[PDB]
């Protein structure tokens, strides 16, 4: 019956960079998954109150979504590509932990994770 604070997308005392690899994570990886027919459940934080999922955040202590990831990239929040790659991996893992194999939401996540993997495979070497 209440959502937590969302993940921070802004922290002025966190040091930041805008690397070639971070630019690809935006213009290639996030863009690819964002436009997908299965992106919609992943485009903002889990609204456990409207979804009637009052255990979600009992179970899920590290929430992540592509709304967050997107703001983080657009805001220049990260130091490196690995922090961002972690965030996508977290989002996928959380889906798997909470739900049961073969639920529509897990197949959605599986499809996006496949594209994620195809895109990251070609992550450029730093400039
Ligand atoms: C009593 C009540 C209170 C509030 C709302 C409702 C109406 N409705 C009844 C139960 C219904 C449950 N529906 C589901 O689709 C839950 C399945 C798991 O869903 C997700 C699981 C998940 O991991 N993620 C990321 C999602 C992201 C977006 C949308 C859904 C999920 C949604 C709310 C009834």
Curated annotation (Swiss-Prot):
There is a cross-link at residue 58 (Glycyl lysine isopeptide (Lys-Gly) (interchain with G-Cter in SUMO2)). This is Bromodomain-containing protein 4. It is found in: Nucleus; Chromosome. The record marks 99 as: Acetylated histone binding. Chromatin reader protein that recognizes and binds acetylated histones and plays a key role in transmission of epigenetic memory across cell divisions and transcription regulation. Remains associated with acetylated chromatin throughout the entire cell cycle and provides epigenetic memory for postmitotic G1 gene transcription by preserving acetylated chromatin status and maintaining high-order chromatin structure. During interphase, plays a key role in regulating the transcription of signal-inducible genes by associating with the P-TEFb complex and recruiting it to promoters. Signal peptide: none annotated. Ubiquitously expressed. Residues 17-123 form the Bromo domain. The NET domain mediates interaction with a number of chromatin proteins involved in transcription regulation (NSD3, JMJD6, CHD4, GLTSCR1 and ATAD5). The C-terminal (CTD) region mediates interaction and recruitment of CDK9 and CCNT1 subunits of the P-TEFb complex. It is also required for maintenance of higher-order chromatin structure. Belongs to the BET family. Interacts with p53/TP53; the interaction is direct. Interacts (via CTD region) with CDK9 and CCNT1, acting as an associated component of P-TEFb complex. Interacts with RELA (when acetylated at 'Lys-310'). Interacts (via NET domain) with NSD3, CHD4, BICRA and ATAD5. The interaction with BICRA bridges BRD4 to the GBAF complex. Interacts (via NET domain) with JMJD6 (via JmjC and N-terminal domains); the interaction is stronger in presence of ssRNA and recruits JMJD6 on distal enhancers. Interacts with NSD3. Interacts with NIPBL. Phosphorylation by CK2 disrupt the intramolecular binding between the bromo domain 2 and the NPS region and promotes binding between the NPS and the BID regions, leading to activate the protein and promote binding to acetylated histones. In absence of phosphorylation, BRD4 does not localize to p53/TP53 target gene promoters, phosphorylation promoting recruitment to p53/TP53 target promoters. JQ1, a thieno-triazolo-1,4-diazepine derivative, and I-BET, a benzodiazepine derivative, have been tested on tumors with success. Treatment with GSK1210151A (I-BET151, a I-BET derivative) has strong effets on mixed lineage leukemia and promotes myeloid differentiation and leukemia stem-cell depletion. It is linked to Cornelia de Lange syndrome 6: A form of Cornelia de Lange syndrome, a clinically heterogeneous developmental disorder associated with malformations affecting multiple systems. It is characterized by facial dysmorphisms, abnormal hands and feet, growth delay, cognitive retardation, hirsutism, gastroesophageal dysfunction and cardiac, ophthalmologic and genitourinary anomalies. CDLS6 inheritance is autosomal dominant.
């Amino acid at each position: 019956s209440m959502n937590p604070p969302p993940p921070e997308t802004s922290n002025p005392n966190k040091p930041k960079r805008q690397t070639n690899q971070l630019q690809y994570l935006l213009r290639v990886v996030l863009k690819t998954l964002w436009k997908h027919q299965f992106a919609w459940p992943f485009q903002q934080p889990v609204d456990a109150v409207k979804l009637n999922l009052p255990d979600y955040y009992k179970i899920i202590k590290t929430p992540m979504d592509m709304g967050t990831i997107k703001k983080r990239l657009e805001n220049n929040y990260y130091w490196n590509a690995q922090e961002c790659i972690q965030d996508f991996n977290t989002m996928f893992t959380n889906c798997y932990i909470y739900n049961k194999p073969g639920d529509d939401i897990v197949l959605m996540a599986e499809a996006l994770e496949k594209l994620f993997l195809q895109k990251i495979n070609e992550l450029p070497t730093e400039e």
